[PDB]
Amino acid sequence: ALFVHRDTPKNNPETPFDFTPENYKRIEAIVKNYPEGHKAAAVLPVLDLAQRQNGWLPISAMNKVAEILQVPPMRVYEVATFYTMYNRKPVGKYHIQVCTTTPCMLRNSDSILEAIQKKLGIKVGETTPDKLFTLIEVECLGACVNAPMVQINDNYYEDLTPKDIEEIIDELKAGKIPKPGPRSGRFSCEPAGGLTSLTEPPKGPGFGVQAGL
Amino acid sequence: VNNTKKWKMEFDTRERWENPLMGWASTADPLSNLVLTFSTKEDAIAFAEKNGWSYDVEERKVPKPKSKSYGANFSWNKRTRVSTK
Amino acid sequence: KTSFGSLKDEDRIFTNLYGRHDWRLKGAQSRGDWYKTKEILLKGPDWILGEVKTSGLRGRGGAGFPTGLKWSFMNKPSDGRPKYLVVNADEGEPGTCKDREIIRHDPHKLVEGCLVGGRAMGARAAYIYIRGEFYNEASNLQVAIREAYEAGLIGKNACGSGYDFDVFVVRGAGAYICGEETALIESIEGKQGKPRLKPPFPADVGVFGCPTTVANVETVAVSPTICRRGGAWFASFGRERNSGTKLFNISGHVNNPCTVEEEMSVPLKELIEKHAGGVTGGWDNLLAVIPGGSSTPLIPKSVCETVLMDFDALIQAQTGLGTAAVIVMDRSTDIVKAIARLIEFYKHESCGQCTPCREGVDWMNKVMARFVRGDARPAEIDSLWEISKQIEGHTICALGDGAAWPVQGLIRHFRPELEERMQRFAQQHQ
Ligand SMILES: NC(=O)C1=CN([C@@H]2O[C@H](COP(=O)(O)OP(=O)(O)OC[C@H]3O[C@@H](n4cnc5c(N)ncnc54)[C@H](O)[C@@H]3O)[C@@H](O)[C@H]2O)C=CC1
Ligand SMILES: Cc1cc2nc3c(=O)[nH]c(=O)nc-3n(C[C@H](O)[C@H](O)[C@H](O)COP(=O)(O)O)c2cc1C
Ligand code: SF4
Ligand code: FES
DSSP: OOSSOOOBTTBSTTSOOOOOHHHHHHHHHHHHTSOTTOGGGGHHHHHHHHHHHHSSOOTTHHHHHHHHHTOOHHHHHHHHHHOTTOOSSOOOSEEEEEEOSHHHHTTTHHHHHHHHHHHHTOOTTEEOTTSOEEEEEEOOOSOGGGOSEEEETTEEEESOOHHHHHHHHHHHHTTOOOOOSBOSSOSSSSOTTOOSSOOSOOOOTTSSOOTTO | OTTSSSEEEOOOOOOEEEOTTTOOEEEOOTTSSOOEEESSHHHHHHHHHHTTOOOOOOOOOOOOOOOOOSGGGGOSSSTTOOSOO | OOOOOOOOTTSOSOTTSSSOSOOSHHHHHTTTTTOSHHHHHHHOHHHHHHHHHHHTOBOTTTTOOBHHHHHHTTOSOOOSSOOEEEEEEOOOSTTOOHHHHHHHHOHHHHHHHHHHHHHHHTOSEEEEEEOTTOHHHHHHHHHHHHHHHHTTSSBTTGGGSOOOBEEEEEEOOSOGGGGSHHHHHHHHTTSOSOOOOSSSOTTTSOGGGSOEEEEEHHHHTTHHHHHHHOHHHHHTSSSTTOOSEEEEEEEESBSSOEEEEEETTOBHHHHHHHHSOOBTTOGGGEEEEESSSTTSOOEETTGGGGOBSSHHHHHTTTSOOTTOEEEEEETTOOHHHHHHHHHHHHHHTOOOOSHHHHHHHHHHHHHHHHHHHTOOOTHHHHHHHHHHHHHTTSSSSTHHHHHHHHHHHHHHHHHHHHHHHHHHHHHHHO
16 A cells, blocks of 8 residues: 555556546535535545545546546545545455454454454455455444444444354355344344333423423 | 854955866965954944955845734635645 | 432433434434424524533533533624534544444434524534445435425524524545544545644634534534523533533443443443443453543553543543543453554554654554563653653644553553563563
């Protein structure tokens, strides 16, 4: 992962890339979201949309974004290199991400990472030869009470075990999609031993409103 | 800016030639490397006039106070918006 | 009142916190949301700010700044520039997952709080900044915003009050530094997540140079309930200057990791033993607790017994409440490896603008890897303390303090363990 670009035959300014017309309409909605005189504020969502169209960011989406939004291409390069969610290298179809921060390392995410590594036959930062998986290691993903967890594309898979995540990878290899949620008895974030709080029904409107309102 | 505090008196640069043996810079000026430091302009002028040297005085150039503000980098309707920070 | 804890289910603001009821508009109006909003928007911005000030609410982002005064900083006549509320839902701090649940299960409370907060300071619109990885949560929030738009609750002639207010949702691109307010303001504008300096404060120059107020999701989603139930009701919980309820995320080496609403001055031991099901291996197996996520220094087992979970009871215990995220490590935790992992996390998520963090966080990462391996002499413990003192207070933003604090806490509470590990390596190697 280098922060300088060399013009490969697969990644050059002459690489064909353009937005589909519905993506052009979405881009114009994104631009219309922001005030006039600040059309440069739409660099992030248009670039994200270009990635979701293409799967990765060559140096043809960045200059296309710079031409569409009327900004210097150096600013688009800065934005692409600053943020970790922009893939400047072609990743596989399924971008597996394993969070190994302390709230997840305490609940043994290393076992999950080792199980994935010895299931797919690759290491961290490596892709499968048939371009179907990509395993990288990330920071905290905002589901620390559901630790350990992985994220595959837009789907959060939480409360995982090595056998369960091996079955998840097997489901993805067959073309199926799994259910993006916790895999234990809990549903979203409640304790596994039942609800300690909020067992009463909500009181509905008009309850406890102060006088004079 | 600590080197721009004192006035200096120097002399004009005369001929320097190459040495036939070793290529060093030979000169015939005794006053080639001689400079003098004065606290004010008037003392330098008095010292130059005392020794009978014709002098040229060039005035001290000091930078004008600018108007620097951090909030101008993020103006709402001005051209002084920074492209990146 | 002196004894705190055990909040009743009638007093909890976030009903449907666990997602067991309907999160859409029909489910929102069956619980109390969007009630008498026309009267709230008509009674006045000064009245709303006074109700917030009387509640004693402090900022739930982690700073603990009083939200009434911070929202009253924007009560000034406009000089022609628009005014903006920006709700921050980045939530990149480890141990914290409350705002994700608030977005996923209660988006209508958030957008009602957005409308009330926009009326409170005369804001023109709302730019809800959400994390890049929270795709489904952002989609649920957009669905709820569309449902509120189609019913006329927000938008043109909001709730039949004559007030003009839009809500916009933007998405990040995976940067923890974008959680900072000025860094978020720079990230919305199409730049990098490099924080600005103060002054200028966001109330004077914010997004696009306009006046802007950055507020947390948890300090926004309670404003309609504060304005409806009453400020004194919200101030009747907790100690003085710690009024109100709070979402706590208990994670780590516990029996049941969970997110639970509770009173502000609940003891940590009572919270763990009542809502988390206890420490894995019992309370005697406890080694350390991080009270407020990775930015706050840890506390050991002996301190952790009789400390209330509010701002002052942790400030006097040389730590902070932070995001109110309790990480529990029992005696089977290599605590040096955990703190080294935290320093590595702060190394990765640093914008690199100002040089003390940019150099010294990598410096502490290197010396902490060497400390975990034990390849050191006892003098660089005090050298690392000096380095952490050199970073804390000399940076643009507060990530430098957030990376210096765990190192200082680990040194102060566990220097004998570092010394014995290092001398064991020195004995076994030579
Ligand atoms: N919630 C989270 O995910 C995280 C929270 N934190 C916590 O955040 C805190 C540090 O954040 P900061 O924003 O730097 O805290 P604090 O210094 O800035 O101030 C909080 C808010 O009050 C405003 N403010 C303060 N004094 C002001 C004044 N005189 N005039 C006008 N406005 C004023 C600031 O602009 C800001 O919006 C720490 O307590 C840290 O533990 C840290 C990392 C992550
Ligand atoms: C590096 C860094 C990251 C932060 N991330 C968040 C965050 O994700 N969510 C949050 O509410 N505050 C975060 N903050 C704190 C904010 O600067 C600010 O205090 C908060 O957004 C608003 O506080 P309030 O609750 O009083 O409105 C972060 C601060 C720093 C220095
Ligand atoms: S402390 Fe670090 S993250 Fe914060 S402004 Fe400085 S370089 Fe950026
Ligand atoms: S530490 Fe892994 S999701 Fe937060």
